């Protein structure tokens, strides 16, 4: 094990911004480090080898520096194609470990989510299962907190979140949270709520429904 860490873990930037990502190794590796770029759905692309060398076909706005324990990848003026995950990899000793990755996404002004809740359709209940869904539409930054409450009791281990990629046009995310329950538990209780906490909300927002109204 040579273990690598990367900071920041996530980074918001604007076009033409100078951006820098650091990789730190658990021991001295000399120059034996590579940088890779990965875009969603695609295989990674080699940017830099031996800490400092630019692979052919890679634009010069990419650059590598470092030796030993500290390395940096710098993009001097960010272009739209540069919004992708970046991975460092040490090639000093096997296993040739990848760092955890840092995602560079697109910066914009804060946008609060619109929150909607959806109870289970009658059709679904024929099946013995009941899904209640909370939707957060069009918010930024990515960081968000969704809590389910039933009869004011906080739920856990019975929900799942799914998030979209950042929208190409308005640079926002949308997110669905899905609380799944057996029809029996579902009929047992009465009030269902999703509580949302996000930077663009001064106060956490709640949407709910009563199963008998």
């Amino acid at each position: 094990d040579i273990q690598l860490t990367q900071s920041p873990s996530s980074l918001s930037a604007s076009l033409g911004d100078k951006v820098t990502i650091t990789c730190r190794a658990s021991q001295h590796i000399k120059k034996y480090l590579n940088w890779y770029q990965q875009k969603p759905g695609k295989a990674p692309k080699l940017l830099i080898y031996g800490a400092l060398n630019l692979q052919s076909g890679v634009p010069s706005r990419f650059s590598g520096r470092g030796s030993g324990t500290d390395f940096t990848l710098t993009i001097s003026s960010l272009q739209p194609e540069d919004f992708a995950t970046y991975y460092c990899q040490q090639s000093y000793s096997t296993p040739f470990t990848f760092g955890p990755g840092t995602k560079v996404d697109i910066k914009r002004t804060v946008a609060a989510p619109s929150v909607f809740i959806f109870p289970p359709s009658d059709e679904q209940l024929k099946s013995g299962t009941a899904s209640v869904v909370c939707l957060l539409n069009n918010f930024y930054p990515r960081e968000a907190k969704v809590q389910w409450k039933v009869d004011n009791a906080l739920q856990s281990g019975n929900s799942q979140e799914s998030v979209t990629e950042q929208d190409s046009k308005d640079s926002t995310y949308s997110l669905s949270s899905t609380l799944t329950l057996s029809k029996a538990d579902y009929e047992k209780h009465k009030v269902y709520a999703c509580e949302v906490t996000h930077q663009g909300l001064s106060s956490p927002v709640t949407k709910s429904f009563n199963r008998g109204e």
Partner: protein
């Protein structure tokens, strides 16, 4: 030029064996290290191991040592990755990649000789699940009582993928179709939602169009408010 071509997506049940391949062209297969990288859904890259097809020397990550075997047949320019017994945790995309060398090889390759993965295959998706092929159940997500949201929940299908459109493609503005999520049951599920003017609910009809080619399902669901 150089090209790495991997075998196709695989859907297997736990306990079954599997061998996926990567066929290379455009360079001397026997004289270059070539290796495998795993990427589980939504997470980073994991280096698994490399093999030198010339002398069949292999180097593995201890995390994968004993779980898999990397092997090659230089006779036919093909590298392999295999499991004798699959787990649900092995669900991932697997990349094969040439591990090429850069530099002069000064001091008999001990300085200025760097290894990096320069050419990659497209990847092979491997899904491990007890589930058998199953078409989706589609449930409406109805708008409540001036902007509204409605959608559809596409639940308990297998394998991926489904495609969702609204009103046969006429409505695109405002649709978010979320990435599918594998559930404990071994079945997939996702949601597709759309935002519309609250005023247009009485005046506009909205339909989920769902296709799941693997089970040959075409479903159309009206989503009505109440």
């Amino acid at each position: 030029q150089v090209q790495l071509v991997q075998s196709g997506a695989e859907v297997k049940k736990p306990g079954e064996s599997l061998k996926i391949s990567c066929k290379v062209s455009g360079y001397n297969f026997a004289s270059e290290w070539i290796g495998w990288v795993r990427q589980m859904p939504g997470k980073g890259l994991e280096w698994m191991g490399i093999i030198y097809p010339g002398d069949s020397d292999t180097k593995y990550s201890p995390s994968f040592q004993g779980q898999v075997i990397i092997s090659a047949d230089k006779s036919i320019n093909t590298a392999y990755l295999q499991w004798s017994s699959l787990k649900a945790s092995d669900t991932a995309i697997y990349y094969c990649a040439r591990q090429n060398h850069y530099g002069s090889g000064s001091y008999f390759y001990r300085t200025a000789y760097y290894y990096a993965m320069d050419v990659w295959g497209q990847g092979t998706t491997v899904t491990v699940s007890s589930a058998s092929t199953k078409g989706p159940s589609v449930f409406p997500l109805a708008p409540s009582s001036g902007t509204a949201a409605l959608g559809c929940l596409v639940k308990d299908y297998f394998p991926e993928p489904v495609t969702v459109s609204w009103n046969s493609g006429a409505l695109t503005s405002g649709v978010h179709t979320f990435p599918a999520v594998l559930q404990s049951s071994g079945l997939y599920s996702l949601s597709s939602v759309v935002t519309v003017p609250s005023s247009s609910l009485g005046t506009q009809t909205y339909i989920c169009n769902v296709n799941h080619k693997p089970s040959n399902t075409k479903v159309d669901k009206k989503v009505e408010p109440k």
